Amino acid sequence: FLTAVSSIDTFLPVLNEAKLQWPTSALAASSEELLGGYVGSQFYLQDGKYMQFQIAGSSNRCELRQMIPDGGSEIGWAVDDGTTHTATSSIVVPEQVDGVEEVTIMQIHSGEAPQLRISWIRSKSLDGVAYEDFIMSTVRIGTGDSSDNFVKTHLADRTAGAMSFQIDVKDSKLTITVNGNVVVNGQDLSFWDGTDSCYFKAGAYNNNPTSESATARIKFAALAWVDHHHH
Ligand SMILES: O=C(O)[C@H]1O[C@@H](O[C@H]2[C@H](O)[C@H](O)[C@@H](O)O[C@@H]2C(=O)O)[C@@H](O)[C@@H](O)[C@@H]1O
Ligand SMILES: O=C(O)[C@H]1O[C@@H](O[C@H]2[C@H](O)[C@H](O)[C@H](O)O[C@H]2C(=O)O)[C@@H](O)[C@@H](O)[C@@H]1O
Known part of the structure:
Protein backbone atom coordinates (compact mmCIF):
# COMPACT_ATOMS: atom_id res chain seq x y z
CA PHE A 1 0.00 0.00 0.00
CA PRO A 94 15.81 11.72 -10.38
CA GLU A 95 16.77 10.84 -13.90
CA GLN A 96 13.66 11.48 -15.97
CA VAL A 97 12.19 8.88 -18.32
CA ASP A 98 12.32 9.39 -22.08
CA GLY A 99 9.70 11.81 -23.32
CA VAL A 100 9.89 14.07 -20.23
CA GLU A 101 11.65 17.24 -21.37
CA GLU A 102 10.99 19.95 -18.75
CA VAL A 103 9.49 19.75 -15.25
CA THR A 104 8.65 22.86 -13.26
CA ILE A 105 9.40 22.16 -9.58
CA MET A 106 8.80 25.57 -7.93
CA GLN A 107 6.93 28.69 -9.05
CA ILE A 108 5.87 32.17 -8.22
CA HIS A 109 2.56 32.45 -10.10
CA SER A 110 -0.31 34.97 -10.18
CA GLY A 111 -3.84 34.95 -11.50
CA GLU A 112 -2.57 35.17 -15.07
CA ALA A 113 1.14 34.37 -15.40
CA PRO A 114 4.23 32.68 -13.99
CA GLN A 115 6.53 35.31 -12.51
CA LEU A 116 9.13 32.58 -11.90
CA ARG A 117 9.52 28.92 -12.82
CA ILE A 118 12.38 26.82 -11.46
CA SER A 119 12.47 23.80 -13.78
CA TRP A 120 14.52 20.77 -14.62
CA ILE A 121 15.18 20.69 -18.35
CA ARG A 122 16.72 17.99 -20.52
CA SER A 123 18.44 20.24 -23.08
CA LYS A 124 18.42 23.98 -23.74
CA SER A 125 20.72 26.72 -25.01
CA LEU A 126 20.86 29.96 -23.01
CA ASP A 127 22.79 33.03 -24.21
CA GLY A 128 24.69 30.91 -26.73
CA VAL A 129 25.67 28.11 -24.33
CA ALA A 130 24.22 24.61 -24.61
CA TYR A 131 23.23 22.93 -21.33
CA GLU A 132 21.95 19.44 -20.59
CA ASP A 133 20.26 17.90 -17.57
CA PHE A 134 20.09 21.04 -15.52
CA ILE A 135 17.96 23.28 -13.30
CA MET A 136 16.86 26.58 -14.85
CA SER A 137 15.12 29.71 -13.68
CA THR A 138 12.71 31.45 -16.05
CA VAL A 139 11.59 34.90 -14.88
CA ARG A 140 8.94 36.87 -16.74
CA ILE A 141 9.54 40.62 -17.02
CA GLY A 142 6.55 41.01 -19.38
CA THR A 143 3.58 39.10 -20.76
CA GLY A 144 4.75 38.98 -24.39
CA ASP A 145 6.16 35.93 -26.13
CA SER A 146 9.48 37.26 -27.44
CA SER A 147 12.75 36.66 -25.63
CA ASP A 148 12.79 40.20 -24.19
CA ASN A 149 9.95 39.14 -21.85
CA PHE A 150 12.13 36.57 -20.05
CA VAL A 151 15.34 36.29 -18.08
CA LYS A 152 16.51 32.69 -18.20
CA THR A 153 19.41 31.46 -16.06
CA HIS A 154 21.29 28.19 -15.58
CA LEU A 155 21.05 27.55 -11.83
CA ALA A 156 22.93 24.23 -11.44
CA ASP A 157 23.50 20.91 -13.15
CA ARG A 158 21.11 18.26 -11.83
CA THR A 159 22.63 16.29 -8.97
CA ALA A 160 21.79 12.77 -7.89
CA GLY A 161 21.56 13.95 -4.29
CA ALA A 162 19.31 16.53 -2.69
CA MET A 163 19.66 20.12 -3.89
CA SER A 164 18.49 22.99 -1.72
CA PHE A 165 16.61 25.95 -3.16
CA GLN A 166 15.40 29.19 -1.68
CA ILE A 167 13.25 31.83 -3.37
CA ASP A 168 13.02 35.29 -1.77
CA VAL A 169 10.96 38.25 -2.99
CA LYS A 170 11.18 41.63 -1.28
CA ASP A 171 10.65 45.17 -2.56
CA SER A 172 10.17 44.04 -6.17
CA LYS A 173 13.42 42.03 -6.25
CA LEU A 174 13.99 38.28 -6.54
CA THR A 175 16.86 36.22 -5.12
CA ILE A 176 17.40 32.50 -5.77
CA THR A 177 19.88 30.56 -3.63
CA VAL A 178 20.97 27.06 -4.68
CA ASN A 179 22.89 24.78 -2.30
CA GLY A 180 23.59 27.81 -0.14
CA ASN A 181 24.98 30.03 -2.92
CA VAL A 182 23.20 33.01 -4.44
CA VAL A 183 22.77 32.39 -8.16
CA VAL A 184 20.13 35.03 -8.99
CA ASN A 185 20.89 38.21 -7.02
CA GLY A 186 18.14 40.82 -6.90
CA GLN A 187 16.43 40.25 -10.26
CA ASP A 188 13.98 43.06 -11.03
CA LEU A 189 10.33 42.05 -10.60
CA SER A 190 8.95 45.62 -10.72
CA PHE A 191 6.99 44.87 -13.89
CA TRP A 192 4.66 43.02 -11.49
CA ASP A 193 4.25 45.90 -9.02
CA GLY A 194 0.62 46.06 -7.91
CA THR A 195 -0.31 42.51 -8.93
CA ASP A 196 -1.83 41.25 -5.67
CA SER A 197 -2.55 37.64 -6.73
CA CYS A 198 0.94 36.10 -6.47
CA TYR A 199 1.55 32.84 -4.64
CA PHE A 200 4.10 30.04 -4.38
CA LYS A 201 3.80 26.59 -5.96
CA ALA A 202 5.94 23.46 -5.82
CA GLY A 203 5.74 19.89 -7.10
CA ALA A 204 5.81 18.66 -10.71
CA TYR A 205 4.34 20.61 -13.64
CA ASN A 206 5.15 18.90 -16.94
CA ASN A 207 6.13 21.18 -19.81
CA ASN A 208 6.60 20.34 -23.51
CA PRO A 209 6.95 16.53 -23.24
CA THR A 210 7.47 14.55 -26.44
CA SER A 211 5.32 11.74 -25.08
CA GLU A 212 2.13 12.42 -23.15
CA SER A 213 2.38 8.99 -21.48
CA ALA A 214 5.85 9.68 -19.99
CA THR A 215 5.62 10.15 -16.21
CA ALA A 216 7.61 12.97 -14.62
CA ARG A 217 8.73 12.27 -11.03
CA ILE A 218 10.15 14.65 -8.41
CA LYS A 219 11.07 13.93 -4.74
CA PHE A 220 10.98 16.63 -2.05
CA ALA A 221 13.05 16.09 1.10
CA ALA A 222 11.74 19.42 2.49
CA LEU A 223 9.39 22.21 1.44
CA ALA A 224 8.16 25.29 3.31
CA TRP A 225 6.80 28.78 2.90
CA VAL A 226 8.66 30.83 5.53
CA ASP A 227 6.61 33.61 7.17
CA HIS A 228 8.77 36.57 8.10
CA HIS A 229 6.00 38.02 10.32
CA HIS A 230 5.40 34.98 12.57
CA HIS A 231 1.60 35.01 12.77
O1 LIG B 1 8.40 27.53 -25.92
C1 LIG B 1 8.72 27.52 -24.71
O2 LIG B 1 9.15 26.46 -24.16
C2 LIG B 1 8.55 28.77 -23.92
O3 LIG B 1 7.93 28.34 -22.67
C3 LIG B 1 7.89 29.44 -21.68
O4 LIG B 1 7.38 28.86 -20.50
C4 LIG B 1 5.98 28.47 -20.58
C5 LIG B 1 5.91 27.06 -20.11
O5 LIG B 1 6.54 26.15 -21.07
C6 LIG B 1 4.51 26.61 -19.90
O6 LIG B 1 3.83 26.59 -21.15
C7 LIG B 1 3.75 27.55 -18.93
O7 LIG B 1 4.34 27.53 -17.79
O8 LIG B 1 3.82 28.95 -19.54
C8 LIG B 1 5.22 29.37 -19.66
C9 LIG B 1 5.21 30.80 -20.15
O9 LIG B 1 4.47 31.09 -21.12
O10 LIG B 1 5.91 31.66 -19.54
C10 LIG B 1 9.26 30.04 -21.42
O11 LIG B 1 10.11 29.03 -20.83
C11 LIG B 1 9.89 30.52 -22.67
O12 LIG B 1 11.25 30.93 -22.34
C12 LIG B 1 9.91 29.47 -23.75
O13 LIG B 1 10.26 30.08 -24.99
O1 LIG C 1 -4.38 25.68 -15.01
C1 LIG C 1 -4.13 26.91 -15.14
O2 LIG C 1 -4.15 27.43 -16.29
C2 LIG C 1 -3.80 27.75 -13.95
O3 LIG C 1 -4.66 27.31 -12.87
C3 LIG C 1 -4.37 28.01 -11.60
O4 LIG C 1 -5.29 27.56 -10.60
C4 LIG C 1 -6.48 28.35 -10.56
C5 LIG C 1 -7.55 27.76 -11.44
O5 LIG C 1 -8.64 28.72 -11.52
C6 LIG C 1 -8.06 26.45 -10.91
O6 LIG C 1 -9.15 25.97 -11.71
C7 LIG C 1 -8.51 26.55 -9.46
O7 LIG C 1 -9.59 27.37 -9.36
O8 LIG C 1 -7.38 27.08 -8.65
C8 LIG C 1 -6.96 28.40 -9.12
C9 LIG C 1 -5.86 28.91 -8.23
O9 LIG C 1 -5.44 28.19 -7.29
O10 LIG C 1 -5.39 30.07 -8.45
C10 LIG C 1 -2.94 27.73 -11.17
O11 LIG C 1 -2.84 26.32 -10.90
C11 LIG C 1 -1.98 28.16 -12.23
O12 LIG C 1 -0.64 27.80 -11.81
C12 LIG C 1 -2.32 27.57 -13.58
O13 LIG C 1 -1.52 28.20 -14.59
Whole structure:
Protein backbone atom coordinates (compact mmCIF):
# COMPACT_ATOMS: atom_id res chain seq x y z
CA PHE A 1 0.00 0.00 0.00
CA LEU A 2 1.08 3.60 -0.67
CA THR A 3 2.32 5.50 2.38
CA ALA A 4 0.81 8.96 2.87
CA VAL A 5 2.96 12.10 2.98
CA SER A 6 1.28 13.22 6.21
CA SER A 7 2.38 10.01 8.00
CA ILE A 8 5.62 11.77 9.04
CA ASP A 9 6.07 15.22 10.52
CA THR A 10 8.37 16.76 7.90
CA PHE A 11 5.79 18.27 5.53
CA LEU A 12 2.97 19.10 7.94
CA PRO A 13 3.76 22.86 8.04
CA VAL A 14 3.50 23.27 4.27
CA LEU A 15 0.55 20.88 3.95
CA ASN A 16 -1.28 23.16 6.41
CA GLU A 17 -0.63 26.00 3.90
CA ALA A 18 -1.36 24.37 0.55
CA LYS A 19 -3.88 22.60 -1.64
CA LEU A 20 -2.90 19.88 -4.12
CA GLN A 21 -3.77 20.37 -7.79
CA TRP A 22 -3.82 17.23 -9.94
CA PRO A 23 -3.88 16.22 -12.79
CA THR A 24 -4.68 19.76 -13.91
CA SER A 25 -5.20 22.86 -11.79
CA ALA A 26 -8.42 21.26 -10.58
CA LEU A 27 -8.47 20.62 -6.85
CA ALA A 28 -7.28 17.15 -5.94
CA ALA A 29 -6.98 17.60 -2.17
CA SER A 30 -7.62 20.48 0.20
CA SER A 31 -5.13 21.32 2.95
CA GLU A 32 -7.36 19.47 5.42
CA GLU A 33 -7.40 16.37 3.20
CA LEU A 34 -3.63 16.48 2.78
CA LEU A 35 -3.13 16.62 6.55
CA GLY A 36 -5.71 13.82 6.84
CA GLY A 37 -3.68 11.33 4.80
CA TYR A 38 -4.64 11.91 1.16
CA VAL A 39 -2.53 9.58 -0.98
CA GLY A 40 -2.28 8.19 -4.50
CA SER A 41 0.39 7.19 -6.98
CA GLN A 42 0.61 10.88 -7.95
CA PHE A 43 1.42 12.02 -4.38
CA TYR A 44 2.90 9.65 -1.79
CA LEU A 45 5.78 9.23 0.64
CA GLN A 46 8.81 7.60 -1.00
CA ASP A 47 11.57 5.95 1.05
CA GLY A 48 9.76 7.00 4.26
CA LYS A 49 11.04 10.55 3.79
CA TYR A 50 10.29 12.15 0.38
CA MET A 51 7.10 13.88 -0.68
CA GLN A 52 7.00 12.49 -4.21
CA PHE A 53 5.00 13.98 -7.08
CA GLN A 54 4.27 12.15 -10.36
CA ILE A 55 2.45 13.30 -13.49
CA ALA A 56 2.22 12.51 -17.20
CA GLY A 57 0.73 14.66 -19.93
CA SER A 58 1.61 17.99 -21.52
CA SER A 59 0.79 20.91 -19.17
CA ASN A 60 -0.55 18.49 -16.54
CA ARG A 61 0.61 18.84 -12.96
CA CYS A 62 0.72 17.37 -9.50
CA GLU A 63 1.50 20.54 -7.57
CA LEU A 64 1.00 22.25 -4.21
CA ARG A 65 -0.49 25.76 -4.37
CA GLN A 66 0.03 28.17 -1.46
CA MET A 67 -3.01 28.78 0.75
CA ILE A 68 -3.75 30.88 3.79
CA PRO A 69 -2.81 28.65 6.76
CA ASP A 70 -5.15 26.64 8.98
CA GLY A 71 -7.83 25.86 6.43
CA GLY A 72 -7.83 29.22 4.67
CA SER A 73 -8.56 30.13 1.07
CA GLU A 74 -6.15 30.90 -1.78
CA ILE A 75 -3.45 33.42 -0.86
CA GLY A 76 -2.50 36.43 -2.93
CA TRP A 77 0.48 38.69 -2.28
CA ALA A 78 2.43 41.31 -4.22
CA VAL A 79 6.12 41.65 -4.99
CA ASP A 80 5.91 45.27 -3.77
CA ASP A 81 3.93 44.80 -0.55
CA GLY A 82 7.13 45.35 1.45
CA THR A 83 7.14 41.90 3.05
CA THR A 84 9.76 39.26 2.28
CA HIS A 85 8.07 36.23 0.70
CA THR A 86 10.18 33.10 1.00
CA ALA A 87 9.91 29.50 -0.22
CA THR A 88 12.50 26.84 0.65
CA SER A 89 12.95 23.30 -0.60
CA SER A 90 15.33 20.39 -0.74
CA ILE A 91 14.71 18.37 -3.90
CA VAL A 92 15.97 15.09 -5.31
CA VAL A 93 15.41 15.28 -9.06
CA PRO A 94 15.81 11.72 -10.38
CA GLU A 95 16.77 10.84 -13.90
CA GLN A 96 13.66 11.48 -15.97
CA VAL A 97 12.19 8.88 -18.32
CA ASP A 98 12.32 9.39 -22.08
CA GLY A 99 9.70 11.81 -23.32
CA VAL A 100 9.89 14.07 -20.23
CA GLU A 101 11.65 17.24 -21.37
CA GLU A 102 10.99 19.95 -18.75
CA VAL A 103 9.49 19.75 -15.25
CA THR A 104 8.65 22.86 -13.26
CA ILE A 105 9.40 22.16 -9.58
CA MET A 106 8.80 25.57 -7.93
CA GLN A 107 6.93 28.69 -9.05
CA ILE A 108 5.87 32.17 -8.22
CA HIS A 109 2.56 32.45 -10.10
CA SER A 110 -0.31 34.97 -10.18
CA GLY A 111 -3.84 34.95 -11.50
CA GLU A 112 -2.57 35.17 -15.07
CA ALA A 113 1.14 34.37 -15.40
CA PRO A 114 4.23 32.68 -13.99
CA GLN A 115 6.53 35.31 -12.51
CA LEU A 116 9.13 32.58 -11.90
CA ARG A 117 9.52 28.92 -12.82
CA ILE A 118 12.38 26.82 -11.46
CA SER A 119 12.47 23.80 -13.78
CA TRP A 120 14.52 20.77 -14.62
CA ILE A 121 15.18 20.69 -18.35
CA ARG A 122 16.72 17.99 -20.52
CA SER A 123 18.44 20.24 -23.08
CA LYS A 124 18.42 23.98 -23.74
CA SER A 125 20.72 26.72 -25.01
CA LEU A 126 20.86 29.96 -23.01
CA ASP A 127 22.79 33.03 -24.21
CA GLY A 128 24.69 30.91 -26.73
CA VAL A 129 25.67 28.11 -24.33
CA ALA A 130 24.22 24.61 -24.61
CA TYR A 131 23.23 22.93 -21.33
CA GLU A 132 21.95 19.44 -20.59
CA ASP A 133 20.26 17.90 -17.57
CA PHE A 134 20.09 21.04 -15.52
CA ILE A 135 17.96 23.28 -13.30
CA MET A 136 16.86 26.58 -14.85
CA SER A 137 15.12 29.71 -13.68
CA THR A 138 12.71 31.45 -16.05
CA VAL A 139 11.59 34.90 -14.88
CA ARG A 140 8.94 36.87 -16.74
CA ILE A 141 9.54 40.62 -17.02
CA GLY A 142 6.55 41.01 -19.38
CA THR A 143 3.58 39.10 -20.76
CA GLY A 144 4.75 38.98 -24.39
CA ASP A 145 6.16 35.93 -26.13
CA SER A 146 9.48 37.26 -27.44
CA SER A 147 12.75 36.66 -25.63
CA ASP A 148 12.79 40.20 -24.19
CA ASN A 149 9.95 39.14 -21.85
CA PHE A 150 12.13 36.57 -20.05
CA VAL A 151 15.34 36.29 -18.08
CA LYS A 152 16.51 32.69 -18.20
CA THR A 153 19.41 31.46 -16.06
CA HIS A 154 21.29 28.19 -15.58
CA LEU A 155 21.05 27.55 -11.83
CA ALA A 156 22.93 24.23 -11.44
CA ASP A 157 23.50 20.91 -13.15
CA ARG A 158 21.11 18.26 -11.83
CA THR A 159 22.63 16.29 -8.97
CA ALA A 160 21.79 12.77 -7.89
CA GLY A 161 21.56 13.95 -4.29
CA ALA A 162 19.31 16.53 -2.69
CA MET A 163 19.66 20.12 -3.89
CA SER A 164 18.49 22.99 -1.72
CA PHE A 165 16.61 25.95 -3.16
CA GLN A 166 15.40 29.19 -1.68
CA ILE A 167 13.25 31.83 -3.37
CA ASP A 168 13.02 35.29 -1.77
CA VAL A 169 10.96 38.25 -2.99
CA LYS A 170 11.18 41.63 -1.28
CA ASP A 171 10.65 45.17 -2.56
CA SER A 172 10.17 44.04 -6.17
CA LYS A 173 13.42 42.03 -6.25
CA LEU A 174 13.99 38.28 -6.54
CA THR A 175 16.86 36.22 -5.12
CA ILE A 176 17.40 32.50 -5.77
CA THR A 177 19.88 30.56 -3.63
CA VAL A 178 20.97 27.06 -4.68
CA ASN A 179 22.89 24.78 -2.30
CA GLY A 180 23.59 27.81 -0.14
CA ASN A 181 24.98 30.03 -2.92
CA VAL A 182 23.20 33.01 -4.44
CA VAL A 183 22.77 32.39 -8.16
CA VAL A 184 20.13 35.03 -8.99
CA ASN A 185 20.89 38.21 -7.02
CA GLY A 186 18.14 40.82 -6.90
CA GLN A 187 16.43 40.25 -10.26
CA ASP A 188 13.98 43.06 -11.03
CA LEU A 189 10.33 42.05 -10.60
CA SER A 190 8.95 45.62 -10.72
CA PHE A 191 6.99 44.87 -13.89
CA TRP A 192 4.66 43.02 -11.49
CA ASP A 193 4.25 45.90 -9.02
CA GLY A 194 0.62 46.06 -7.91
CA THR A 195 -0.31 42.51 -8.93
CA ASP A 196 -1.83 41.25 -5.67
CA SER A 197 -2.55 37.64 -6.73
CA CYS A 198 0.94 36.10 -6.47
CA TYR A 199 1.55 32.84 -4.64
CA PHE A 200 4.10 30.04 -4.38
CA LYS A 201 3.80 26.59 -5.96
CA ALA A 202 5.94 23.46 -5.82
CA GLY A 203 5.74 19.89 -7.10
CA ALA A 204 5.81 18.66 -10.71
CA TYR A 205 4.34 20.61 -13.64
CA ASN A 206 5.15 18.90 -16.94
CA ASN A 207 6.13 21.18 -19.81
CA ASN A 208 6.60 20.34 -23.51
CA PRO A 209 6.95 16.53 -23.24
CA THR A 210 7.47 14.55 -26.44
CA SER A 211 5.32 11.74 -25.08
CA GLU A 212 2.13 12.42 -23.15
CA SER A 213 2.38 8.99 -21.48
CA ALA A 214 5.85 9.68 -19.99
CA THR A 215 5.62 10.15 -16.21
CA ALA A 216 7.61 12.97 -14.62
CA ARG A 217 8.73 12.27 -11.03
CA ILE A 218 10.15 14.65 -8.41
CA LYS A 219 11.07 13.93 -4.74
CA PHE A 220 10.98 16.63 -2.05
CA ALA A 221 13.05 16.09 1.10
CA ALA A 222 11.74 19.42 2.49
CA LEU A 223 9.39 22.21 1.44
CA ALA A 224 8.16 25.29 3.31
CA TRP A 225 6.80 28.78 2.90
CA VAL A 226 8.66 30.83 5.53
CA ASP A 227 6.61 33.61 7.17
CA HIS A 228 8.77 36.57 8.10
CA HIS A 229 6.00 38.02 10.32
CA HIS A 230 5.40 34.98 12.57
CA HIS A 231 1.60 35.01 12.77
O1 LIG B 1 8.40 27.53 -25.92
C1 LIG B 1 8.72 27.52 -24.71
O2 LIG B 1 9.15 26.46 -24.16
C2 LIG B 1 8.55 28.77 -23.92
O3 LIG B 1 7.93 28.34 -22.67
C3 LIG B 1 7.89 29.44 -21.68
O4 LIG B 1 7.38 28.86 -20.50
C4 LIG B 1 5.98 28.47 -20.58
C5 LIG B 1 5.91 27.06 -20.11
O5 LIG B 1 6.54 26.15 -21.07
C6 LIG B 1 4.51 26.61 -19.90
O6 LIG B 1 3.83 26.59 -21.15
C7 LIG B 1 3.75 27.55 -18.93
O7 LIG B 1 4.34 27.53 -17.79
O8 LIG B 1 3.82 28.95 -19.54
C8 LIG B 1 5.22 29.37 -19.66
C9 LIG B 1 5.21 30.80 -20.15
O9 LIG B 1 4.47 31.09 -21.12
O10 LIG B 1 5.91 31.66 -19.54
C10 LIG B 1 9.26 30.04 -21.42
O11 LIG B 1 10.11 29.03 -20.83
C11 LIG B 1 9.89 30.52 -22.67
O12 LIG B 1 11.25 30.93 -22.34
C12 LIG B 1 9.91 29.47 -23.75
O13 LIG B 1 10.26 30.08 -24.99
O1 LIG C 1 -4.38 25.68 -15.01
C1 LIG C 1 -4.13 26.91 -15.14
O2 LIG C 1 -4.15 27.43 -16.29
C2 LIG C 1 -3.80 27.75 -13.95
O3 LIG C 1 -4.66 27.31 -12.87
C3 LIG C 1 -4.37 28.01 -11.60
O4 LIG C 1 -5.29 27.56 -10.60
C4 LIG C 1 -6.48 28.35 -10.56
C5 LIG C 1 -7.55 27.76 -11.44
O5 LIG C 1 -8.64 28.72 -11.52
C6 LIG C 1 -8.06 26.45 -10.91
O6 LIG C 1 -9.15 25.97 -11.71
C7 LIG C 1 -8.51 26.55 -9.46
O7 LIG C 1 -9.59 27.37 -9.36
O8 LIG C 1 -7.38 27.08 -8.65
C8 LIG C 1 -6.96 28.40 -9.12
C9 LIG C 1 -5.86 28.91 -8.23
O9 LIG C 1 -5.44 28.19 -7.29
O10 LIG C 1 -5.39 30.07 -8.45
C10 LIG C 1 -2.94 27.73 -11.17
O11 LIG C 1 -2.84 26.32 -10.90
C11 LIG C 1 -1.98 28.16 -12.23
O12 LIG C 1 -0.64 27.80 -11.81
C12 LIG C 1 -2.32 27.57 -13.58
O13 LIG C 1 -1.52 28.20 -14.59
